[PDB]
PDB file of C-alpha atoms and ligand atoms in Angstrom:
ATOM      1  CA  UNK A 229      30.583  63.674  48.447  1.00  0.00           C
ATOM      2  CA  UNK A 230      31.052  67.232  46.485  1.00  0.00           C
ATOM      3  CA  UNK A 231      32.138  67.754  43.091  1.00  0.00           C
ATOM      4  CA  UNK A 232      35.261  66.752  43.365  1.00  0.00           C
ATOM      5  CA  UNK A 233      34.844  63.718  44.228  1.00  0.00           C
ATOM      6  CA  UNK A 234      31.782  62.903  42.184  1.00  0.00           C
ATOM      7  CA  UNK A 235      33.388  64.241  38.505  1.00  0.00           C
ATOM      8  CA  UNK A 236      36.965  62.040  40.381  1.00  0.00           C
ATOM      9  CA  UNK A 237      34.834  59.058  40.317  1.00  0.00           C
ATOM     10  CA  UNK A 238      33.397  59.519  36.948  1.00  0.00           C
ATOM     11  CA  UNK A 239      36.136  60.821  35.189  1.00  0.00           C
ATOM     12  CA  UNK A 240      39.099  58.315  36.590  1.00  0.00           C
ATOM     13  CA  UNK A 241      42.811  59.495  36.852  1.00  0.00           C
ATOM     14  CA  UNK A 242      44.988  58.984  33.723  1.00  0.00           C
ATOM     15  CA  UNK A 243      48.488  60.542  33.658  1.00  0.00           C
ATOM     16  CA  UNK A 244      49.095  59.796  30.431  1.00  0.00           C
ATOM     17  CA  UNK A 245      47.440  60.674  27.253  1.00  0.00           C
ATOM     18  CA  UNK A 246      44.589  58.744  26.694  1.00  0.00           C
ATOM     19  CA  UNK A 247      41.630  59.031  24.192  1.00  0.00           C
ATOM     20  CA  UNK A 248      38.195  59.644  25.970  1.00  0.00           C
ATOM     21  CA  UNK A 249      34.916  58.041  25.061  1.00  0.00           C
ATOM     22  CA  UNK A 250      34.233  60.411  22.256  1.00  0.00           C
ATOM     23  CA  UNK A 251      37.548  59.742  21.177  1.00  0.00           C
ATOM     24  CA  UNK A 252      39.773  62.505  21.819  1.00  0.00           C
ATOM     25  CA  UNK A 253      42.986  63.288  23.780  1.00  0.00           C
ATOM     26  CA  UNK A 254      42.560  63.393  27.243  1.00  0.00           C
ATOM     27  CA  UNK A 255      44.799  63.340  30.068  1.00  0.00           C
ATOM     28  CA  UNK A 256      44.536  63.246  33.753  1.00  0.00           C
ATOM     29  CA  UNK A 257      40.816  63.819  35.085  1.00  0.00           C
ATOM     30  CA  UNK A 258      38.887  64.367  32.470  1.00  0.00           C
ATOM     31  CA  UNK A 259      40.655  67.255  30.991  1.00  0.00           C
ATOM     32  CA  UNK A 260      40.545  67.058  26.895  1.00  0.00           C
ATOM     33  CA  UNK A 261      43.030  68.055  25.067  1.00  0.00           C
ATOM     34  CA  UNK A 262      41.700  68.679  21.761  1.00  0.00           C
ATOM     35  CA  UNK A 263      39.445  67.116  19.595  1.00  0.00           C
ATOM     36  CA  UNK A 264      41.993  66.791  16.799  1.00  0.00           C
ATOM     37  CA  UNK A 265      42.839  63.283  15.582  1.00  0.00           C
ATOM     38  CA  UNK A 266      46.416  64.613  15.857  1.00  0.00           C
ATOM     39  CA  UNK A 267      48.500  63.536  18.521  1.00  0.00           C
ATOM     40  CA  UNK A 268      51.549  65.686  18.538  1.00  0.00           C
ATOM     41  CA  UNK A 269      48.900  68.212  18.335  1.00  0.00           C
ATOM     42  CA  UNK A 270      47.498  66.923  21.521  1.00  0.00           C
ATOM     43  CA  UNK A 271      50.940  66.847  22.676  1.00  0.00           C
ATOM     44  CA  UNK A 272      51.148  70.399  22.386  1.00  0.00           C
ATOM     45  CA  UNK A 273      48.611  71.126  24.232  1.00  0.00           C
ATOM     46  CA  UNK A 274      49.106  69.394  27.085  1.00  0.00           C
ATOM     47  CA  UNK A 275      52.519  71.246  27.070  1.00  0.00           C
ATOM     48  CA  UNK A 276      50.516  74.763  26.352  1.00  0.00           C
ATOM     49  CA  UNK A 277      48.591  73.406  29.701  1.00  0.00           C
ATOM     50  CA  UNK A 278      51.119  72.749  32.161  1.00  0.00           C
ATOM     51  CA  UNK A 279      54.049  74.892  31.060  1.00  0.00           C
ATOM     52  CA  UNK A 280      56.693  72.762  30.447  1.00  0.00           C
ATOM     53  CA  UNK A 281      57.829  70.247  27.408  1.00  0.00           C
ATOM     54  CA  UNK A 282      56.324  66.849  28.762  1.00  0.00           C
ATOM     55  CA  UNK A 283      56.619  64.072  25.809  1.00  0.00           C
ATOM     56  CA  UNK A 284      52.636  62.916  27.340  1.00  0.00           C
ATOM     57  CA  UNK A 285      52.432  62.050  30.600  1.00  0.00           C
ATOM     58  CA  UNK A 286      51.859  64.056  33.872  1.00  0.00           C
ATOM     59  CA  UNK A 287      52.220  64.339  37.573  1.00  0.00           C
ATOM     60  CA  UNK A 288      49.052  63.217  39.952  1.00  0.00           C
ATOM     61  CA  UNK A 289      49.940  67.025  41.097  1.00  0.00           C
ATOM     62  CA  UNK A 290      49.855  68.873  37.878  1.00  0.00           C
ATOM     63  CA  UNK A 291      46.590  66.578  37.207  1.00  0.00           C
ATOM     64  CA  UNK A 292      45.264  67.385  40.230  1.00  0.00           C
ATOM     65  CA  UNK A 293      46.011  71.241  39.387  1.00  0.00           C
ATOM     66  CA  UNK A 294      44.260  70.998  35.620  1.00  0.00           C
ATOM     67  CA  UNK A 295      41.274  69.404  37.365  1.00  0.00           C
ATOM     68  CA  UNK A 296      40.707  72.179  39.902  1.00  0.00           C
ATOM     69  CA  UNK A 297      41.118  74.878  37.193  1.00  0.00           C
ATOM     70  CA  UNK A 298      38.772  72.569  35.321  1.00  0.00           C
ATOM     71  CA  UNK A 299      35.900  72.922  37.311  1.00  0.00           C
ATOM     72  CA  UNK A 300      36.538  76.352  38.512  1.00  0.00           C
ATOM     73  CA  UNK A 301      36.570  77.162  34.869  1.00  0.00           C
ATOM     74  CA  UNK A 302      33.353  75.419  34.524  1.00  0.00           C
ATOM     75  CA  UNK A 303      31.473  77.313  37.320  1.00  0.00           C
ATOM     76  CA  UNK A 304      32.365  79.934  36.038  1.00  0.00           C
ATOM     77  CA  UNK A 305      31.499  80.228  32.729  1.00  0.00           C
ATOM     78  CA  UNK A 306      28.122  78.324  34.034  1.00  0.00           C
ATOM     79  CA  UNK A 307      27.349  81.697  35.758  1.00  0.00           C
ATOM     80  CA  UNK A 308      28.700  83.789  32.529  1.00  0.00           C
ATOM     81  CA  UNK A 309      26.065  81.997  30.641  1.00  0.00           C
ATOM     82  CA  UNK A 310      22.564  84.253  30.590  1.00  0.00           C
ATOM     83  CA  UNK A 311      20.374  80.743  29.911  1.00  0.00           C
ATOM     84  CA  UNK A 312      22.364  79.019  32.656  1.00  0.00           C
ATOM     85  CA  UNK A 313      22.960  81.074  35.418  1.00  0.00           C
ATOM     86  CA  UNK A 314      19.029  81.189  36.628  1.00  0.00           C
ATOM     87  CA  UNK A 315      19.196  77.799  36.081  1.00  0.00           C
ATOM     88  CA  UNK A 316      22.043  76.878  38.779  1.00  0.00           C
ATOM     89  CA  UNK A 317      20.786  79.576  40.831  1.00  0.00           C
ATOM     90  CA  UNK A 318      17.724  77.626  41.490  1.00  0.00           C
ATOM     91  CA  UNK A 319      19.154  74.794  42.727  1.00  0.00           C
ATOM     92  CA  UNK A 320      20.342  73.062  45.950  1.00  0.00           C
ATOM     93  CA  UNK A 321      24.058  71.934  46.422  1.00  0.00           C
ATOM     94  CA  UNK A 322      23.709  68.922  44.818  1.00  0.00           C
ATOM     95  CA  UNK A 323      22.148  68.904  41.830  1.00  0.00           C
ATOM     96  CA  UNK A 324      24.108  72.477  40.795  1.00  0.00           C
ATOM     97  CA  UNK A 325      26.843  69.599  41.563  1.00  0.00           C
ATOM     98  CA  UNK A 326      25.285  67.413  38.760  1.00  0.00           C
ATOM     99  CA  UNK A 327      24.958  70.836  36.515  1.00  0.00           C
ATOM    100  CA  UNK A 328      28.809  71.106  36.796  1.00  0.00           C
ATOM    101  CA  UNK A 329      29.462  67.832  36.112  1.00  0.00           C
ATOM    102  CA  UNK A 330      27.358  67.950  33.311  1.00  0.00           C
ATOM    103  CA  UNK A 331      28.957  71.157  31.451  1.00  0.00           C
ATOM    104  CA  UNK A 332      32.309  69.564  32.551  1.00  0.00           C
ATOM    105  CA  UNK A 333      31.547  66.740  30.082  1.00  0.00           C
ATOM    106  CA  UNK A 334      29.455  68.083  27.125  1.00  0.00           C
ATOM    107  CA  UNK A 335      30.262  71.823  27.326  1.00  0.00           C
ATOM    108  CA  UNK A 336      28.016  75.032  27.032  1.00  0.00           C
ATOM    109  CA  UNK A 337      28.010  73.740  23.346  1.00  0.00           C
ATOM    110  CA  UNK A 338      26.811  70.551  24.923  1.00  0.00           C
ATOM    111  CA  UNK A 339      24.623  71.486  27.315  1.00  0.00           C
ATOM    112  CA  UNK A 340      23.040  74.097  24.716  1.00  0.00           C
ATOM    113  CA  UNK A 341      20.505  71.271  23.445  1.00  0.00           C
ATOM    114  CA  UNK A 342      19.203  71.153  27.148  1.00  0.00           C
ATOM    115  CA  UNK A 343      17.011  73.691  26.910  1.00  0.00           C
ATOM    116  CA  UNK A 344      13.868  72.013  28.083  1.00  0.00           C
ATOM    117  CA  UNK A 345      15.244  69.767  30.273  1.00  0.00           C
ATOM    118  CA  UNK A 346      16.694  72.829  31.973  1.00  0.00           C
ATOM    119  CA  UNK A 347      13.866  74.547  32.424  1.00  0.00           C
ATOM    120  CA  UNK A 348      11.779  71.616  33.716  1.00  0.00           C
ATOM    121  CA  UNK A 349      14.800  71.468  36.476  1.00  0.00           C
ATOM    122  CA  UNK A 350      14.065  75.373  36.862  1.00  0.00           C
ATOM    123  CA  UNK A 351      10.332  74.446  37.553  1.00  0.00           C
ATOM    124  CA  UNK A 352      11.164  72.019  40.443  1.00  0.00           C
ATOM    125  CA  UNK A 353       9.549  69.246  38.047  1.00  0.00           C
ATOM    126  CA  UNK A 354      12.249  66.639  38.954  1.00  0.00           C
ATOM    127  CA  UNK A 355      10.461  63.380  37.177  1.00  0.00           C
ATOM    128  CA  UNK A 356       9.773  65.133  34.274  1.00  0.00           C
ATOM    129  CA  UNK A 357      13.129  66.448  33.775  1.00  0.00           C
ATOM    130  CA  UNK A 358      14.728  63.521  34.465  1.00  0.00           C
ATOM    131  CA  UNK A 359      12.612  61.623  31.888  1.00  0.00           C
ATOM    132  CA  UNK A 360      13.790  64.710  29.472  1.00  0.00           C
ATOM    133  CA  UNK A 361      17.373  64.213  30.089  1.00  0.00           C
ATOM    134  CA  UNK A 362      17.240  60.520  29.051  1.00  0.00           C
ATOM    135  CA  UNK A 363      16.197  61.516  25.683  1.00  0.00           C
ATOM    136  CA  UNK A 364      19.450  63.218  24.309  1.00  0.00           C
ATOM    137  CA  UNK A 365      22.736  61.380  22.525  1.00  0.00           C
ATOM    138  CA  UNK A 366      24.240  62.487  25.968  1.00  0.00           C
ATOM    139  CA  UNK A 367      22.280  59.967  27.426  1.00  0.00           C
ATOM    140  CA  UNK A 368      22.597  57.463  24.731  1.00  0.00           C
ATOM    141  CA  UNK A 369      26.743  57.466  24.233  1.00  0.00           C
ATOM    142  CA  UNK A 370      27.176  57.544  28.406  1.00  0.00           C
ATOM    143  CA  UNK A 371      24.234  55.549  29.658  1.00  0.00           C
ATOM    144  CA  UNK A 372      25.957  54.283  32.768  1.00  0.00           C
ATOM    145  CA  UNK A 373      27.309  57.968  33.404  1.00  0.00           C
ATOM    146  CA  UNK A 374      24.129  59.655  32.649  1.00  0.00           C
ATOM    147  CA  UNK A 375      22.234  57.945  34.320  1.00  0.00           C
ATOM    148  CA  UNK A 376      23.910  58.741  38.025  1.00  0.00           C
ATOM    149  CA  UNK A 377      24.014  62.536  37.046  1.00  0.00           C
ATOM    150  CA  UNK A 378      20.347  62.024  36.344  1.00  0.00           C
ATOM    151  CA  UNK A 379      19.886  60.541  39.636  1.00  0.00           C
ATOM    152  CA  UNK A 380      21.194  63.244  41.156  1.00  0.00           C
ATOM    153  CA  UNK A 381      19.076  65.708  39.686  1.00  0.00           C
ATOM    154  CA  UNK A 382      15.749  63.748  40.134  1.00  0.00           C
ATOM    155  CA  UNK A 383      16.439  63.312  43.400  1.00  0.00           C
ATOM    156  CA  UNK A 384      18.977  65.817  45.064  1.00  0.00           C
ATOM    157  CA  UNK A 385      20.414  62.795  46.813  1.00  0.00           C
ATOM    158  CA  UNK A 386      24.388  61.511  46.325  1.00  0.00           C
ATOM    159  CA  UNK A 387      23.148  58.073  46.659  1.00  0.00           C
ATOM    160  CA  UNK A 388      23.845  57.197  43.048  1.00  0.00           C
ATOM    161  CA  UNK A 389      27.472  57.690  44.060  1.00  0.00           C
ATOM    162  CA  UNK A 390      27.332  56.083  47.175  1.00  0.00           C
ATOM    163  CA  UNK A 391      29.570  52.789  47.045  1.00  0.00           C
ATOM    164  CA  UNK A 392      31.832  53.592  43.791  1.00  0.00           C
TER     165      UNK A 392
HETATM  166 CL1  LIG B 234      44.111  74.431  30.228  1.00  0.00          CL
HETATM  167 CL1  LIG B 235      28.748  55.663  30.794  1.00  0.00          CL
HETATM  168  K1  LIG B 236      37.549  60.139  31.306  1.00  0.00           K
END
């Protein structure tokens, strides 16, 4: 298991534009679009992205090549970010694994409301945190999801992921 595989398996594979579960354009592995309810506008993004005039639909490649620029992307503004960075520096393998995930899906914007569940991961106080993360819309709009990432980060273990 790495991150790869983890946000592949939670994410799926779509090569054509699809709407995620907040409702937006999406495309391949869980890269959105734009949140606009337009979807030439979505269109044109997706063009802007991969650098050629597609009409919606993409290559497992090129899909493959927005992911990985994705979660680079990801890291690295995770490490840019002066609340973050301590955060993921504290942590093992795995659950800076979850942290990725985590900003992959709701943002810095996203994971800005985290604040105390953050530092309660900082403190090593893996219950508590987890019992903190549950109580967030996060949570409550992607139970099923949530609920493995929180896994991971009360426990450290992949085992949440294990079987899927
Ligand atoms: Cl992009
Ligand atoms: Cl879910
Ligand atoms: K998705």
């Amino acid at each position: 298991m790495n991150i790869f595989e983890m946000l592949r398996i939670d994410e799926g594979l779509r090569l054509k534009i699809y709407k995620d579960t907040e409702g937006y354009y999406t495309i391949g592995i869980g890269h959105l679009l734009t949140k606009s309810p337009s979807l030439n506008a979505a269109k044109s993004e997706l063009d802007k992205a991969i650098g050629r005039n597609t009409n919606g639909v993409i290559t497992k490649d090129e899909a493959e090549k927005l992911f990985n620029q994705d979660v680079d992307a990801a890291v690295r503004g995770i490490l840019r970010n002066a609340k973050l960075k301590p955060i993921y520096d504290s942590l093992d393998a795995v659950r800076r694994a979850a942290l990725v995930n985590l900003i992959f899906q709701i943002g810095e914007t996203g994971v800005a409301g985290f604040t105390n569940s953050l530092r309660y991961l900082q403190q090593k106080r893996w219950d508590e945190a987890a019992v903190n993360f549950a109580k967030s819309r996060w949570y409550n709009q992607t139970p099923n999801r949530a609920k493995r990432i929180i896994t991971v980060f009360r426990t450290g273990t992949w085992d949440a992921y294990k079987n899927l």
